[PDB]
Enzyme design. Structure first.
Site, PDB file in Angstrom:
ATOM      1  N   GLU A  52       1.331  -7.083 -46.050  1.00 48.45           N
ATOM      2  CA  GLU A  52       1.348  -7.179 -44.597  1.00 48.45           C
ATOM      3  C   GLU A  52       0.578  -6.023 -43.976  1.00 48.45           C
ATOM      4  OE1 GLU A  52       5.198  -6.565 -43.000  1.00 48.45           O
ATOM      5  OE2 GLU A  52       4.537  -6.586 -40.908  1.00 48.45           O
ATOM      6  N   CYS A  60       7.437 -10.314 -43.797  1.00 49.09           N
ATOM      7  CA  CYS A  60       8.463  -9.280 -43.859  1.00 49.09           C
ATOM      8  C   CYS A  60       9.847  -9.798 -43.489  1.00 49.09           C
ATOM      9  CB  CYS A  60       8.084  -8.113 -42.943  1.00 49.09           C
ATOM     10  SG  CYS A  60       9.296  -6.776 -42.884  1.00 49.09           S
ATOM     11  N   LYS A  94       3.044 -13.886 -36.665  1.00 45.31           N
ATOM     12  CA  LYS A  94       4.460 -13.587 -36.832  1.00 45.31           C
ATOM     13  C   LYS A  94       5.221 -13.919 -35.556  1.00 45.31           C
ATOM     14  CE  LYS A  94       7.611  -9.951 -38.380  1.00 45.31           C
ATOM     15  NZ  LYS A  94       7.737  -8.537 -38.823  1.00 45.31           N
TER      16      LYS A  94
END
Length: 492
Positions: A267, A371, A335
């Site tokens: 990431e 994540c 995200k």
């Protein structure tokens, strides 16, 4: 002395609640003791017996505080190292987080001992699981939620793993609360009937784990090389280390071209705006297409949106064979579920769409998560599609340091692969990068806190699990039915 005048006292009950909450943290990945979850839940339910609603709420709050002051203390590493708040202030922040997370457990205990005061099977087996499901939903929903430290994730290698593909990890949370209370009902009362009922209810899902809800495809097996750059978190967002990080990743990736079909970077591997690093990405995509491979990498992208003001997304982008790169291409993942106090201030990254198309890379469709998003089973399932071959997750656990947080995150990631029956390709800056199998099994893993590359052959899986085919609503229907029955039998 005596041992009957001590348990009845409330202060001893608060101490025991703290002890059982603390011991329940040994059930997760760094320790992997699934009986600890059962013992902790049994202690939680047994210590709230014969208590008033306020006293039982206090006991539940103490149990939750014991659970969340030891299960999640790695957050301290995320505050003391990264932040100007002194040591006492960081301690106060961690204490506030633990108290907030234990407020939900206190509410659960208070409601359970208010609506169901007497210690009967209707409380432990019927009311407790439904109320615990509602409380955990509230904990994971309010203020963007934080569904960490759920005992269902502790059963990945346990007997109840095979219940996850059918109804989801929260269903395990339903069963563990259901069984343990029955054990508690057999502990405070010398009755073997609750013990037998709990043994039967625990030994029934065990045969329900040899079932394979997936078909392996031994013709699209590809070599995946996930790159772990081990970039330090102190200098990651520095202009002086942007060139060094790019050089490290490119020199780690260049030998892999022509031998690995898919290459994955962690990431925010490119610690710069996507628009700024355009020539580098174009040249990289050209080289990847020439050799023949696909690279999926995390980056930060700034989009002018519709109001002509920049929107900042933490995106995953794809380059190379089967996925040409362009600044305007739908082959991207923004995200959506941002981390509180890490990316935005509740009450500044932007949020991508809740449902996004799976990434296409060299003929392989990847369901991508970033994540913190991998611990949300419902969102991953909603983004999951039948055409998906692998589950993609890129994270950066360097914030948590050398602590237990990375392993808990890794276990929650493995639970997704177990639920959806798809291989999970987890890549991290320095954390646990692995290829989790379709049954939540570690097929490959490289040592943590080092700069290595995980290059392994992986095989796609087709088919749909019952969880990925119906969703999470059957569990909610069971919870609603149990709650309605318990409430209706309590009005008398």
């Amino acid at each position: 002395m005596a041992f009957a005048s001590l348990i009845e006292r409330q202060r001893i009950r608060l101490l025991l609640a703290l002890l059982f909450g603390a011991c329940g943290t040994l059930a997760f990945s760094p320790y992997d003791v699934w009986p600890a979850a059962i013992i902790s839940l049994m202690g939680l339910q047994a210590l709230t017996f014969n208590r008033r609603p306020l006293q039982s709420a206090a006991i539940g709050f103490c149990w939750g505080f014991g659970l969340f002051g030891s299960g999640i203390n790695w957050v301290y590493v995320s505050i003391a190292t990264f932040g100007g708040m002194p040591g006492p202030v960081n301690i106060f922040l961690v204490v506030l987080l633990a108290a907030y997370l234990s407020l939900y457990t206190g509410l659960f205990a208070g409601v359970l001992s208010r609506l169901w005061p007497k210690t009967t099977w209707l409380r432990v087996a019927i009311a407790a699981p439904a109320l615990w499901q509602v409380t955990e939903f509230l904990r994971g929903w309010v203020l963007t939620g934080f569904p960490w430290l759920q005992f269902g994730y502790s059963q990945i290698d346990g007997p109840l793993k095979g219940l996850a593909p059918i109804m989801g990890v929260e269903a395990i949370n339903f069963l563990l609360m259901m069984v343990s209370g029955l054990l508690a009902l057999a502990l405070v009362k010398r009755n073997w009937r609750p013990l037998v009922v709990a043994v039967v209810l625990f030994a029934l899902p065990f045969p329900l784990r040899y079932i394979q809800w997936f078909t392996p495809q031994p013709e699209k097996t590809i070599q995946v090389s996930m790159v772990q750059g081990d970039i330090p978190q102190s200098l990651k967002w520095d202009e002086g280390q942007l060139l060094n990080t790019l050089k490290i990743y490119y020199n780690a990736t260049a030998p892999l071209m022509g031998k690995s079909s898919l290459i994955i970077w962690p990431e925010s591997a490119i610690t710069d705006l996507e628009i700024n690093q355009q020539p580098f990405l174009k040249a990289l995509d050209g080289e990847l297409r020439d050799k023949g491979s696909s690279l999926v990498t995390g980056i930060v992208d700034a989009r002018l949106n519709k109001q002509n003001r920049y929107d900042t997304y933490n995106t995953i982008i794809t380059l190379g064979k089967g996925a040409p790169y362009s600044y305007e291409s739908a082959d991207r993942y923004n995200k959506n579920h941002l981390v509180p106090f890490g990316e935005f201030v509740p009450l500044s990254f932007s949020r991508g769409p809740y449902i996004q198309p799976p990434l296409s890379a060299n003929g392989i469709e990847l369901t991508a998560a970033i994540c913190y998003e991998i611990i949300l089973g419902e969102q991953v399932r909603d983004n999951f599609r039948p055409d998906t071959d692998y589950l993609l997750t890129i994270s950066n656990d360097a914030w948590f340091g050398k602590s237990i947080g990375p392993w808990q995150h890794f276990q929650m990631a493995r639970m997704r692969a177990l639920e959806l029956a798809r291989p999970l390709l987890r890549s991290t800056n320095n954390g646990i990068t692995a290829v989790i199998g379709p049954q939540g099994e570690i097929q490959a893993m490289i040592p943590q806190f080092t700069r290595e590359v995980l290059t392994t052959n992986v095989t796609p899986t087709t088919g749909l699990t019952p969880y990925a085919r119906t969703g999470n609503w059957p569990l909610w229907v069971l919870t609603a039915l149990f709650g309605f029955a318990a409430v209706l039998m309590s009005l008398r």
